[PDB]
Amino acid sequence: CGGGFSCHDGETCCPTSQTTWGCC
């Protein structure tokens, strides 16, 4: 995914919030 945050290779994109998302 490519919302509006950064992450490390290997991590998965999952829903963390209602308006914003995050990694797992």
TrEMBL record:
Which locations, inside or outside the cell, does it occupy?
Answer: Secreted
Top-level taxon of origin: Eukaryota
Disulfide partners? C1-C13, C7-C23, C14-C24
**Protein family according to the UniProt entry:** Belongs to the granulin family.
Quote the protein name from its UniProt record: Granulin-A
